[PDB]
Amino acid sequence: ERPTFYRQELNKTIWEVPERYQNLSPVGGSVCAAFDTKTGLRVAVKKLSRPFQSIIHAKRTYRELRLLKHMKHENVIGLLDVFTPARSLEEFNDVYLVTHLMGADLNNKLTDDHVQFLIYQILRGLKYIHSADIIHRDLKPSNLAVNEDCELKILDFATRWYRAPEIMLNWMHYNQTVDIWSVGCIMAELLTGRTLFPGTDHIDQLKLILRLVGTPGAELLKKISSESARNYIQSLTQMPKMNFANVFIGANPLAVDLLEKMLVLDSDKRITAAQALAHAYFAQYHDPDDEPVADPYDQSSESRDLLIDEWKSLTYDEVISFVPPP
Ligand SMILES: CCCCCCCCO[C@@H]1O[C@H](CO)[C@@H](O)[C@H](O)[C@H]1O
C-alpha cells in the first residue's frame, strides 16, 4: 500500500503526487489539470496553500475537507481522492485534493429544453445540499460547472448580482432560500442573455430588485426587527410588483411562473428546491425517486476553538480514512 510519489516543479512551487496522476498542467490553493491513469479521467488536482499556517487556516482546511468528503451526489462536486506525501503525522504539511476536471462553467441564448435541464440539475443538487443543512450562499454562474453533455455540478469555490437582498442588508439569520433567489437570477439570465440585476453597487442593486418585485408589503414589514430598516423602507415611494411576462417576453409561461415563485422578497414565501423540482416547468426531467437527499452534515466542528496541532491531527485523520468513490 501507499502509492509511489514523484516530484516536479510547477508554477513557482514543488508538487509531489502519486504516479497515477500524469501530465500536470497548471490552470493555477493552486490547481493543475492532470490525467488520472487509473480511472481514465481528466482531473483537477488542488495543492492547498498554507493549510496549517494558523489556527484559522487549519480550521478552514479541516472544514473544506470534511465538506468535500460528505458530498456524494451527481450534481455536486465530489472528492475523487485526497492525499499527502507525508508518511506520518509528524511529517504532515501538505494536502492535495483531487476532483473531476470540469470543462466549462455557466459563465462560458439557450433553448427552453436546455434551460430546463440546467436549472433542473441546479435544483437537484441544491435539494441535496439543503437536505444536509448546508446553505451555499454564493451560487452564481462561475460556481456551476458543465461538461459536454450539459451535465452540471455545483462547485464550492466577487460579483453580487446573484445575491439575495437579505444578504446585502446584512440580515444575518439566513434561510436556505437565499440560494433559490440566486437560482432565479441565474435562470433569468439563461432565458434573456442578460444579467437580471446588474447593479453598480449594493444600493443600485437593491433599487433594481425593488423595481421588479416592488417595495415590501405590510406582511413583510411585520418581520423586520431592525427599527432603522423599517424607517427607511417606509420612506420609500411604494412601487408595485412589475408583471414578469413583460420582463421575460416570449419565455415559456411555466418558466415565468417558476420565476415569480423564486424571486419573492420574503424568503419565507420563496419556493424550496424540493418544491421547485415538482413544478410543471420540469415535467420532462422530474423523477421523485431519483432526487436523493444527504445525511445532515455536522457543522459543530466549527464553533470549536482548538490548537493548530489539534486541527492538523483532525485533518490528518480525515485524509487517512478517505475511501474513494467505488
Ligand atoms: C428593502 C428590501 C428588503 C428586503 C426584504 C428581505 C426579506 C427577506 O425575507 C426574510 O428573511 C429572513 C431571514 O431568513 C426571515 O427571518 C424572515 O421571515 C423573512 O421575511
CSV table of N, CA and C and ligand atoms in Angstrom, one decimal, residues 165-166 169 171-175 178 206 210 216 220 223-224 233 236 265-268 270, ligand 1:
chain,number,residue,atom,x,y,z
A,165,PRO,N,-31.3,39.7,-1.4
A,165,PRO,CA,-31.4,41.0,-0.8
A,165,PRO,C,-31.0,41.1,0.7
A,166,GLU,N,-31.5,40.0,1.4
A,166,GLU,CA,-31.3,39.9,2.8
A,166,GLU,C,-29.8,39.9,3.1
A,169,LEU,N,-28.4,43.3,2.9
A,169,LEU,CA,-28.8,44.1,4.1
A,169,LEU,C,-28.1,43.6,5.3
A,171,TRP,N,-28.6,40.9,7.0
A,171,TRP,CA,-29.6,40.4,7.8
A,171,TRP,C,-29.1,39.5,8.9
A,172,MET,N,-28.0,38.7,8.7
A,172,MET,CA,-27.7,37.5,9.4
A,172,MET,C,-29.0,36.7,9.5
A,173,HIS,N,-29.1,35.6,10.3
A,173,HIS,CA,-30.2,34.7,10.1
A,173,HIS,C,-30.6,34.6,8.6
A,174,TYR,N,-30.1,33.6,7.9
A,174,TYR,CA,-30.4,33.4,6.5
A,174,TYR,C,-31.1,32.1,6.4
A,175,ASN,N,-32.2,32.0,5.6
A,175,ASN,CA,-32.8,30.7,5.3
A,175,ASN,C,-32.1,30.2,4.0
A,178,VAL,N,-32.1,31.7,0.4
A,178,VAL,CA,-31.2,32.6,-0.2
A,178,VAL,C,-30.7,32.0,-1.5
A,206,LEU,N,-30.1,46.9,-5.0
A,206,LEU,CA,-31.4,46.8,-4.3
A,206,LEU,C,-32.4,47.7,-5.0
A,210,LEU,N,-36.1,46.0,-6.2
A,210,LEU,CA,-37.4,46.6,-5.8
A,210,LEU,C,-38.2,47.0,-7.0
A,216,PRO,N,-41.4,46.3,-0.2
A,216,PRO,CA,-42.0,45.4,0.8
A,216,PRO,C,-43.5,45.7,1.2
A,220,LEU,N,-44.5,41.7,5.2
A,220,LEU,CA,-43.0,41.6,5.4
A,220,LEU,C,-42.5,42.6,6.4
A,223,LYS,N,-42.1,41.6,9.9
A,223,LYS,CA,-41.0,40.6,10.3
A,223,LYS,C,-39.6,41.3,10.4
A,224,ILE,N,-39.6,42.6,10.3
A,224,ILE,CA,-38.3,43.4,10.3
A,224,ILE,C,-38.2,44.0,11.7
A,233,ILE,N,-37.4,51.8,4.9
A,233,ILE,CA,-38.3,51.2,3.9
A,233,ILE,C,-39.7,51.9,3.9
A,236,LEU,N,-40.0,55.0,1.5
A,236,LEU,CA,-39.8,54.8,0.0
A,236,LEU,C,-41.2,55.0,-0.7
A,265,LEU,N,-39.5,38.7,-2.3
A,265,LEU,CA,-38.7,39.4,-1.4
A,265,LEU,C,-38.6,38.6,-0.1
A,266,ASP,N,-39.8,38.2,0.3
A,266,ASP,CA,-39.9,37.5,1.6
A,266,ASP,C,-39.4,36.0,1.4
A,267,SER,N,-38.3,35.7,2.1
A,267,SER,CA,-37.7,34.5,1.9
A,267,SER,C,-38.5,33.3,2.3
A,268,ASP,N,-39.4,33.5,3.3
A,268,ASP,CA,-40.4,32.5,3.7
A,268,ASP,C,-41.4,32.1,2.7
A,270,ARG,N,-40.6,32.1,-0.7
A,270,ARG,CA,-39.9,31.5,-1.9
A,270,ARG,C,-40.1,30.0,-1.9
B,1,LIG,C1,-35.6,46.8,1.0
B,1,LIG,C2,-35.5,45.3,0.7
B,1,LIG,C3,-36.0,44.5,1.9
B,1,LIG,C4,-35.5,43.0,1.8
B,1,LIG,C5,-36.5,42.2,2.5
B,1,LIG,C6,-36.0,40.8,2.7
B,1,LIG,C7,-36.9,39.9,3.4
B,1,LIG,C8,-36.2,38.5,3.4
B,1,LIG,O1,-37.1,37.5,4.0
B,1,LIG,C9,-36.9,37.4,5.4
B,1,LIG,O2,-35.6,36.9,5.7
B,1,LIG,C10,-35.4,36.4,7.0
B,1,LIG,C11,-34.0,35.7,7.0
B,1,LIG,O3,-34.2,34.4,6.5
B,1,LIG,C12,-36.5,35.8,7.8
B,1,LIG,O4,-36.2,35.7,9.2
B,1,LIG,C13,-37.9,36.3,7.5
B,1,LIG,O5,-39.0,35.5,8.0
B,1,LIG,C14,-38.2,36.8,6.1
B,1,LIG,O6,-39.2,37.8,5.9
